[PDB]
Design a binder for this molecule. Sequence first.
Ligand SMILES: *[C@@H]1O[C@H](CO)[C@@H](O[C@@H]2O[C@H](CO)[C@@H](O[C@@H]3O[C@H](CO[C@H]4O[C@H](CO)[C@@H](O)[C@H](O[C@H]5O[C@H](CO)[C@@H](O)[C@H](O)[C@@H]5O[C@H]5O[C@H](CO)[C@@H](O)[C@H](O)[C@@H]5O)[C@@H]4O)[C@@H](O)[C@H](O)[C@@H]3O)[C@H](O)[C@H]2NC(C)=O)[C@H](O)[C@H]1NC(C)=O
Ligand SMILES: *[C@@H]1O[C@H](CO[C@@H]2O[C@@H](C)[C@@H](O)[C@@H](O)[C@@H]2O)[C@@H](O[C@@H]2O[C@H](CO)[C@@H](O[C@@H]3O[C@H](CO)[C@@H](O)[C@H](O[C@H]4O[C@H](CO)[C@@H](O)[C@H](O)[C@@H]4O)[C@@H]3O)[C@H](O)[C@H]2NC(C)=O)[C@H](O[C@@H]2O[C@@H](C)[C@@H](O)[C@@H](O)[C@@H]2O)[C@H]1NC(C)=O
Ligand SMILES: O=C(CCN1CCN(C(=O)OCc2cc(Cl)cc(Cl)c2)CC1)c1ccc2[nH]c(=O)oc2c1
Ligand SMILES: *[C@@H]1O[C@H](CO)[C@@H](O[C@@H]2O[C@H](CO)[C@@H](O)[C@H](O)[C@H]2NC(C)=O)[C@H](O)[C@H]1NC(C)=O
Ligand SMILES: [Ca+2]
Ligand SMILES: [Ca+2]
Ligand SMILES: [Cl-]
Ligand SMILES: [K+]
Ligand code: NA
Ligand code: NA
Ligand SMILES: [Zn+2]
Ligand SMILES: [Zn+2]
Length: 785
Amino acid sequence: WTNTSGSCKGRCFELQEVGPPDCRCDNLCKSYSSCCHDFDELCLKTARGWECTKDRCGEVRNEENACHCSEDCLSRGDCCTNYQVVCKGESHWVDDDCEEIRVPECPAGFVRPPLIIFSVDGFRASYMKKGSKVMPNIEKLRSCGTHAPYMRPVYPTKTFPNLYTLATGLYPESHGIVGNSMYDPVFDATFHLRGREKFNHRWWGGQPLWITATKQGVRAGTFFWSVSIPHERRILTILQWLSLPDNERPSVYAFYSEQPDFSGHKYGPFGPEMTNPLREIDKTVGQLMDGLKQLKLHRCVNVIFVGDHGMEDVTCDRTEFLSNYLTNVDDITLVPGTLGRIRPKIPNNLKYDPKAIIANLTCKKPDQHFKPYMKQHLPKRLHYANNRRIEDLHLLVERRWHVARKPLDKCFFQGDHGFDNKVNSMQTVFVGYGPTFKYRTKVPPFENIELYNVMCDLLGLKPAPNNGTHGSLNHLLRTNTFRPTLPEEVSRPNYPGIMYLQSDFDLGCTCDDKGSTEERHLLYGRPAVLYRTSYDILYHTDFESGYSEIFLMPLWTSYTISKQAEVSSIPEHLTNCVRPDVRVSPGFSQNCLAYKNDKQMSYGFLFPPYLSSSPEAKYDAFLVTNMVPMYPAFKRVWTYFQRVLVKKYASERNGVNVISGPIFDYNYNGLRDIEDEIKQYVEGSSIPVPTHYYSIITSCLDFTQPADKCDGPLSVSSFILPHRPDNDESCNSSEDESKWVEELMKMHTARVRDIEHLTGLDFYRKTSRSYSEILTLKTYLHTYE
Ligand SMILES: *[C@@H]1O[C@H](CO)[C@@H](O[C@@H]2O[C@H](CO)[C@@H](O[C@@H]3O[C@H](CO[C@H]4O[C@H](CO)[C@@H](O)[C@H](O[C@H]5O[C@H](CO)[C@@H](O)[C@H](O)[C@@H]5O[C@H]5O[C@H](CO)[C@@H](O)[C@H](O)[C@@H]5O)[C@@H]4O)[C@@H](O)[C@H](O)[C@@H]3O)[C@H](O)[C@H]2NC(C)=O)[C@H](O)[C@H]1NC(C)=O
Ligand SMILES: *[C@@H]1O[C@H](CO[C@@H]2O[C@@H](C)[C@@H](O)[C@@H](O)[C@@H]2O)[C@@H](O[C@@H]2O[C@H](CO)[C@@H](O[C@@H]3O[C@H](CO)[C@@H](O)[C@H](O[C@H]4O[C@H](CO)[C@@H](O)[C@H](O)[C@@H]4O)[C@@H]3O)[C@H](O)[C@H]2NC(C)=O)[C@H](O[C@@H]2O[C@@H](C)[C@@H](O)[C@@H](O)[C@@H]2O)[C@H]1NC(C)=O
Ligand SMILES: O=C(CCN1CCN(C(=O)OCc2cc(Cl)cc(Cl)c2)CC1)c1ccc2[nH]c(=O)oc2c1
Ligand SMILES: *[C@@H]1O[C@H](CO)[C@@H](O[C@@H]2O[C@H](CO)[C@@H](O)[C@H](O)[C@H]2NC(C)=O)[C@H](O)[C@H]1NC(C)=O
Ligand SMILES: [Ca+2]
Ligand SMILES: [Ca+2]
Ligand SMILES: [Cl-]
Ligand SMILES: [K+]
Ligand code: NA
Ligand code: NA
Ligand SMILES: [Zn+2]
Ligand SMILES: [Zn+2]
């Protein structure tokens, strides 16, 4: 119980959090039904509106007014934002020329620039194309400050997962807010957009920016605004807090707008009804900038104008129904819409057959507008699996479409979001303006998981452990850049020489018949191994590898293919050639007998014999130390990549450096598995089966320079292919590989950083580039939009 008969007099929007039985006056009181009886009348004043008029200039202060035009209002920090414009002949901030901020220009008592996070819900990246005619304030921030053409949100491209990702620097699978709605099987409770369940602390993991701030003695403003508090009041409150004494004043502030998301759902992103809501948000930005200018803070504060996700054209008519694919939809619960998550209606039903359900949802209609996946098979770039709240069965929905259980479940909407985070329509905005951000600078697109580290740096805070790559966004900043340190190598390699004779081996294999290796094939230095293990560096004419004695295969295989390289076929008599490696013991080698016995498992090679520099060098590609276990269905993908696509990339990019290898992620946590976690081996052997195969393809950004003679920045594209026993994911896989393999690889595009987490390897340790630039390169994701 709370005594609401108390009063908010002189307590409106107080920073001290009050709890029952005392009545609250803070912004959050509304969502706990604990505001004092007079909160609306004292704290949500609307009298005379939000703008000063000429007749109000120099007025005697009236406490009933929403905002003031009295001579004392600047010293009290509660002027209407246009006070100096109307009463003192000042210009609106938007009308001022763009002037470089070389150092913060703050009033006395400020020791560092405050940070204001201006969050806009559903602000699609392409809305910026409307320019100054629609949004002059936002356009000025964008062109005068630092901006990206777009920022990549996290999957699902929904509000609660993305806002909490912005606050923590974590993937939803780690922070726990995996959707706008979610069922936790341990709690046996459901989190919803509406209701009280979401207010329970048990759902919210990690460490949000406001907690990081308070734990390190930095004061934070609210990061939650009640829908009943109008935007003009949110801006005035922030300005009032910025006017508090030095010992009370917060260092970080957040503003939130439900728009343009609200109108986006009603009218779609291309709707003519979108113009007025965008003009209204721009007016709010204008009030904040004018408000800051009159308080002499417009060249003091850092402003981050950021969105949570974009908006797509989605209609009721474009809905796929599970009732058209499955006999009994009454036995299942579906999280529907722009994504699908399926689980049995009865939480632990033994009759629930996910295998039969997936089979009925796989390639059943030619233009099917969704694809089913067991969560561990989802593209690794989504990082959407390691949480009990994520159902095993997932449906990736095609952009512009919805999925529903049955038809029973005019249309209420014309727009929606939630789709795959690489989708153009889901892309959102990023603008950084102020003394710490760069002046009139465009930066390449980046992921929202990276902002938490930057916000910590802008506030002098040590970030909590997160999924960002600290230093990868250093190019956005004038100052407060993070000096990163190269991770120390944990395991030094062995460099084995010849220690065995051909006669020492009995592997059941048959075969009919250092130097400059490092310089040519290892262009960016040796990858470092960041965990404790036993491995060997093996040199060859055409490739170099880091061979694991534990996993009996390379952790990585590195090779360079020039633009002029010749592709050759494997001679008929060498098709089944596998040769013992005299540098590696029989006890630390794979064997052909295991592969022959295993009627479901074949083998591939990491360095392809097809790309050998000579028939003599080709024999090295058939070494037992270059072989890896591969399902025949996967070999169709792998062989096409090696025989066709590597040469294609070398020819188009002027040579390529390729690093390929296995990945073991049986527990789908996005991290390298330890031995005990491996759940599949080649029949009757200790040869582990990878869950995935990666490749990192590097070349010169300036393609007029060959990959092996690049003087400047690099260009990279990578992938993490699922090692599957079938090609059920690719509906057109019965056709030639030229019709589907590339499409599959593009879907499984990845960052070098994703591969580093999955392998415990550290790449690009020896380049002529700055470490900050290399960190940006590692976070790059090649999208095929
Ligand atoms: C993205 O970045 C994060 C953060 O660095 C990485 O996640 C971390 O991984 C390490 C190594 O696996 C984990 O440490 C292990 O776990 C415990 C400590 O765990 C407890 O204490 C920490 C710190 O106080 C706390 O954050 C943990 O919170 C988990 O559990 C809460 C209660 O259930 C929950 O609310 C919260 O969301 C979080 O759940 C998530 O993590 C667990 C695993 O911990 C996972 O099962 C679950 O599905 C969620 O994803 C927890 O109380 C140590 O004793 C061990 O020795 C070991 O060191 C960290 O706990 C974990 N941190 C977080 C915040 O998840 C990701 O790996 C990285 N991803 C990639 C791909 O790089
Ligand atoms: C819920 O709150 C009501 C409103 O009170 C205000 O808000 C609360 C949260 C708190 O901040 C209060 O201080 C605010 O007044 C409560 O009603 C009030 O109850 C108090 C008594 O508990 C009343 O007081 C007296 O007011 C007189 C003036 O009108 C004073 O002269 C008097 O002072 C004498 O007594 C004190 C205490 O011994 C001495 O120290 C002094 O020297 C002096 O001799 C008191 O201060 C107040 O007037 C009430 N306000 C109103 C508007 O009625 C409410 O309390 C309940 O209801 C009231 C009507 C009484 O029956 C209470 O006994 C009863 O608890 C709160 N509800 C609950 C359940 O606690
Ligand atoms: O329910 C909501 C919004 C509810 N709140 C979001 C959080 N919020 C707030 O002020 O967040 C501010 C904030 C918090 C954090 Cl963690 C981080 C930052 Cl950078 C900023 C209050 C309003 C919603 C929004 C869009 C939707 N689209 C849709 O289909 O359903 C929707 C529901
Ligand atoms: C998968 O789809 C098939 C239809 O293609 C379902 O099988 C049919 O079920 C009905 C009963 O509703 C029978 O009358 C038909 O004879 C069945 N057809 C065939 C070809 O067997 C099947 O039930 C679906 N499975 C699931 C799990 O939904
Ligand atoms: Ca319309
Ligand atoms: Ca793992
Ligand atoms: Cl959801
Ligand atoms: K076999
Ligand atoms: Na509230
Ligand atoms: Na197929
Ligand atoms: Zn949103
Ligand atoms: Zn929305």
